[PDB]
Structures are given as structure tokens and as C-alpha cells.
Amino acid sequence: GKAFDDGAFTGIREINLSYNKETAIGDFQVVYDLNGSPYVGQNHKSFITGFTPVKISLDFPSEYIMEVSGYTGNVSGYVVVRSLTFKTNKKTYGPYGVTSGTPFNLPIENGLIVGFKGSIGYWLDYFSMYLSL
Amino acid sequence: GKAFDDGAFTGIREINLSYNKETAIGDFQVVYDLNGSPYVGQNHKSFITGFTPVKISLDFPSEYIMEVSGYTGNVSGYVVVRSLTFKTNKKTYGPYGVTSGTPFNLPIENGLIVGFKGSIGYWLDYFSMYLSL
Amino acid sequence: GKAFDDGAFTGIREINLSYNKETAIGDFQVVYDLNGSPYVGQNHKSFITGFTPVKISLDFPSEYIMEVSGYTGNVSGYVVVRSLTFKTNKKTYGPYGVTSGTPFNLPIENGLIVGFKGSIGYWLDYFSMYLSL
């Protein structure tokens, strides 16, 4: 896959991703907050099309993510992120994509997700998250 | 004075300021680092013009500011920042302005200046600094 | 169970835990670093005894935990932490306990675990980690 690394920002305003229940998460793009203004992150695209788009527009800064969870699993021979869910202090967005395989979850008791990095080929290979107060 | 607040970034690549040895610091604009790329900050300009510009181009990321110092004093009835000096791990830049009045200094033993906020009218009235690891 | 919260420290020198290969994790005690000296954490004990004790003595400060993983699941009707594994930059310690139920994992790319909180009854019910630079 192609590695990406958006870096760290002040917060999250919107997450745009796509998925296919037969396979996994495809595209990933974030609109960050940067010191009170929207920062449009680069769109990290799957090498293929056919995905359903999702836009998660948060009520920033009143609303923020409190838990990211999902599943990893094998798709056509590759371990990828099959499913994502974003729970905020207001609502739960997802699951997006097939909720099968090895679960993972990052609940946050205190602090904020402020950035993403990862790699996307046909599908999201892996990701990590920047956390801050 | 018009308040300004750049917020916090990843580091500092360049400081553009202006001064007049008759008076005090006038304008202030920083080129920040934001996740390894330049981010050109807002240019905070005095209500008046006639100042001499200076550009401090730092050898980012190896070179960084370790101490900011200056003088505050009265200019035409306004108490303002009359002089600034920026000491990096490599060199000292300044003093710029008029080294007269009440001194101030912020030395940093561990950590980085990652942003500035303050107020500029005819001259730089005051400023603060965001610090991070 | 009994909730506990050690708060945050400078790092981790040693983890003492206990487990039973038929049930789940029992006791948990950390020797933290506090400003370059050991700080002996409170010993969070199960309400029952008979567990097998494990001492993980890290080569602090150079060896530090990079992933905590394990399994949650049912023991006598309660959801508990059945297994723990600690992976450092040098070695893996574990698994300790029973590796069944729902997996979880916290890998860290940058930063440190500097504290633990949670709850223990007959077994470790749940836990959270403090992270810092």
C-alpha cells in the first residue's frame, strides 16, 4: 500500500472514508481542526473503486471521538482494516464495513485524537492515531 | 491594538518582524513548521508603516530558539515591546529595536516554542508563546 | 471489585502480576520510575489468593513497553481480563493467563505508559493506561 501520515493537528472536524462489506475500508481523508480553522487533509485513495462513501461531520468542538474500534482480517490474501466505528460523546458512527475478523478498540478516557497515519493499497492496510490533551 | 493568536504548530522555520530604532517593534509574522512542511502564518501588521523589515531564517529542524528576550518601554504614551532578541542553539539574532526600559526573558531548558499570540496596534503591545515538547 | 488508580509517573521499572492458567489475571503491582528513582506502587490484590506470581523486571530506562495485549472474557459469569502480554522494544513477556475470549491490543509508536488504573475483584475486571511523552 501507499503510506500516508497526516501529522498532528488541534482536533477533528470530519472523517471521509469509503467501504465495501464484501472487502474492507477503501479511501480515507480527514478534515482536521487547525487552531480553530478547518484543515483539509490529503485524500488517501484506494487503488480501486467500487466503495460506498461515508462522511462523518462532527459538531466540533462540542463533539469529539471517545472510541475508535474496528476489525482486521484477511482480504484476498492481505491483512487489512475491514471495519471501523467512531463513537463520540454524542453518537456512534458505524460500523462501516464488515464486522468480522480480529476486533481492536481504542477507548479514550482523557485526551483527543489529533491525527492519522497509515497505508492504503486496495484497502486500508493499517493505521495509527496521534493523541494529545 | 488588534489581538492575534496563531495557535500551536510543530516548530518554527522563520520569523519576519520589523522595527524602528526611533520607536519599537512593528510587525510580526512567523513561518511555522506544520508536520514537516512550511505553514505561512498570518502577517500581524502595525496600524502604521515606516518600519525596517528583518527576516530570521532558521536552519530548521536543527536550529531552534532557546531564549526570547527584550525590553518594554513607553513610546509616545504607549507601553510596548521596544526590542526583541532571539537566541537559538546556533546563534543570537538581535537585539532589534531600542534596548531601553524594563527587561524580560524566557529561557527554555526543555521544550520548543510552537506558536505566538499577542496584540499589535502602532507597535507590538505584548505577546505570549505556546510551548510544547 | 475494588477500583484502583495509580495516576501518572515518569516511566516503568517493573510489573508484578499474578495469574491462573484456568481463570484469569489476579493481582497487579507496578514499580514506577518517579524522576529517576523507583517508586513502589500500591499492590492491587485479588480478593482471593493462590495465583502464580510473575515479575517482569525491565531494563529501565532503555527497555520500555511498546504493546500491551490480552484477552477479555467470561469467568464465573463476570467479564474479566483473562490474559495479558507485554511486548517491549527488547522482549516479549507472556502470555499470562488464558488466551480466550475477545482480544484487545494497545501498540504504541511514540510515547510511554506512565500509569495504570482499573478494578480487581476475584480477577482483574478492567484496566486503563496513562500515556505521556
Binding site: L106, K117, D125, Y126, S132 | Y64 | P107, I108, G111, L131
Partner: peptide
């Protein structure tokens, strides 16, 4: 150096 640092958790997914 001159670059600010942040906690990063992960990665989840492939090696």
C-alpha cells in the same frame, strides 16, 4: 530537535 512530538498509538492492521 526543532520538531514537536506527539503520542502515537497503533498501528492496527497489517505488519
Amino acid at each position: 530537535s526543532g520538531i514537536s512530538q506527539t503520542v502515537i498509538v497503533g498501528p492496527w492492521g497489517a505488519k
